[PDB]
Amino acid sequence: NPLFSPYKMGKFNLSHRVVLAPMTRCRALNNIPQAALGEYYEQRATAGGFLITEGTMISPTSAGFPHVPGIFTKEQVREWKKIVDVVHAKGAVIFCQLWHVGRASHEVYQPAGAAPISSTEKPISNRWRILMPDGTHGIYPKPRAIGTYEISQVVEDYRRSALNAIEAGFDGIEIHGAHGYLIDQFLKDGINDRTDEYGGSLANRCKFITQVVQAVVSAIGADRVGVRVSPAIDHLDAMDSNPLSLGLAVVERLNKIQLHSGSKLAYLHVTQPRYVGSEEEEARLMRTLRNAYQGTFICSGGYTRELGIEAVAQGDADLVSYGRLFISNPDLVMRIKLNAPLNKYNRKTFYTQDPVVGYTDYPFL
Numbered sequence: 001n002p003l004f005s006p007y008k009m010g011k012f013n014l015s016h017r018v019v020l021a022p023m024t025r026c027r028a029l030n031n032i033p034q035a036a037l038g039e040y041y042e043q044r045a046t047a048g049g050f051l052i053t054e055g056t057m058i059s060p061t062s063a064g065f066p067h068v069p070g071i072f073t074k075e076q077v078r079e080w081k082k083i084v085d086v087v088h089a090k091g092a093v094i095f096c097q098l099w100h101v102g103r104a105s106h107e108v109y110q111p112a113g114a115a116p117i118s119s120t121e122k123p124i125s126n127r128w129r130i131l132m133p134d135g136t137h138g139i140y141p142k143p144r145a146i147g148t149y150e151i152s153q154v155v156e157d158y159r160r161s162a163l164n165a166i167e168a169g170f171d172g173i174e175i176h177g178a179h180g181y182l183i184d185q186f187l188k189d190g191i192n193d194r195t196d197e198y199g200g201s202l203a204n205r206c207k208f209i210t211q212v213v214q215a216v217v218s219a220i221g222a223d224r225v226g227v228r229v230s231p232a233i234d235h236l237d238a239m240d241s242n243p244l245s246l247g248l249a250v251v252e253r254l255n256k257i258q259l260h261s262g263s264k265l266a267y268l269h270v271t272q273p274r275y276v277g278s279e280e281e282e283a284r285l286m287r288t289l290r291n292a293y294q295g296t297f298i299c300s301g302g303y304t305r306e307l308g309i310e311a312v313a314q315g316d317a318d319l320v321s322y323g324r325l326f327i328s329n330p331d332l333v334m335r336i337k338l339n340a341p342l343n344k345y346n347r348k349t350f351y352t353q354d355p356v357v358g359y360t361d362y363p364f365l
């Protein structure tokens, strides 16, 4: 089973290639990491396995889900340290995903009920609704378009949060540049209607992600920085007219950062769409991004045991991250190794607040 051949991801000797994908679960009440998160990540940690946390706030304006953890305060750092410690005690590597939602927010999630920020004033359409704190679904509002100075202050929020993650003991951070969130609102030409230096051409649309990655690289070192993108995922009305071209343009900037800095990033992590031909066209897009990128490639999106084995065997990825199956299978790594049955997951408790129910009570083998 090639998922169980070891992989050297920079300094890290991973014993297998099954990665915990970042998953928002909304148990970090009032944005403070809770003891429940420690139990949840501990359950999933394995010796030599790699875990990526749920998206974590970089500032007070960065959230668009309830009870998502932050890492922008020293209080949040103290609580994250306890979780990192239990994960490291099991021999796992753990990165903190840094997440800003941009326009995918609501007055209820913003300080003083202010408008969310974006590259544009265009809102997400009414075909998508936002989960509210009371469990109902609400309307995405019109965001405020930010200027070049405010962009630099958002970049500084990423930098400070990356420093805080390292203070908490994380092995590194992942930049969430996917799924229609802030960075993707600058990348995708279906959203970014700017006429300044952050809009228009591929180079201008890639400016923001380049600036974010450069700032965190210069703060903590390229080896402790991964980057996640999703050029062909259309979530939250975030489409590009040419996803393969956009993806390659991002890869070009990442390769250039590495050459200029003198060091490789930890990895490029790409989520692909899954449609139920499209599967071959999408596989060729993924393989082309992998081939173009100078370093470690993590694939994600709809992977199963069989598809993960194929991705590694065929050279299409170095590591394979799993989301939904890892929600319901704390021992997913072992189940994949043994080709054991998998527990069904309960979508109704993906984003609820109970510290146990639908969170840590899915059974082991």
Ligand SMILES: NC(=O)C1=CN([C@@H]2O[C@H](COP(=O)(O)OP(=O)(O)OC[C@H]3O[C@@H](n4cnc5c(N)ncnc54)[C@H](OP(=O)(O)O)[C@@H]3O)[C@@H](O)[C@H]2O)CCC1
Binding pocket: 024, 055, 178, 179, 233, 235, 274, 275, 301, 302, 324, 347
């Ligand atoms: N912070 C973030 O970055 C967030 C990322 N998210 C991403 O947003 C997108 C939309 O998420 P979703 O929960 O609204 O939809 P999705 O998980 O893709 O499934 C939509 C329907 O298609 C079903 N589906 C069963 N397999 C498949 C399959 N391979 N492919 C796409 N659909 C499938 C799927 O069945 P499940 O209940 O999950 O079994 C579901 O009923 C996804 O790409 C998701 O990964 C969630 C929100 C937080």
Ligand SMILES: NC(=O)C1=CN([C@@H]2O[C@H](COP(=O)(O)OP(=O)(O)OC[C@H]3O[C@@H](n4cnc5c(N)ncnc54)[C@H](OP(=O)(O)O)[C@@H]3O)[C@@H](O)[C@H]2O)CCC1
Binding pocket: 325, 341, 342, 343, 344, 345, 346
């Ligand atoms: N061990 C598992 O089953 C796992 C499922 N997983 C996912 O967990 C989620 C929860 O499962 P669910 O029962 O709540 O939803 P679903 O799998 O879509 O099936 C709903 C009902 O339709 C039934 N069903 C099933 N396949 C059919 C069919 N081809 N035609 C018609 N009816 C069908 C199915 O019967 P089974 O329990 O599978 O025997 C079930 O009663 C699903 O998204 C599932 O994809 C994770 C992987 C392992």
Ligand SMILES: Cc1cc2nc3c(=O)[nH]c(=O)nc-3n(C[C@H](O)[C@H](O)[C@H](O)COP(=O)(O)O)c2cc1C
Binding pocket: 021, 022, 023, 024, 025, 053, 054, 055, 097, 099, 176, 178, 179, 228, 271, 300, 301, 302, 303, 321, 322, 323, 324, 325, 350
């Ligand atoms: C409940 C849930 C929450 C998620 N939260 C995040 C998130 O915080 N950050 C992110 O980059 N992706 C997030 N994702 C996307 C997953 O990381 C991953 O790409 C997707 O689940 C992989 O597909 P799979 O579920 O078929 O393995 C989330 C997915 C789900 C289902």
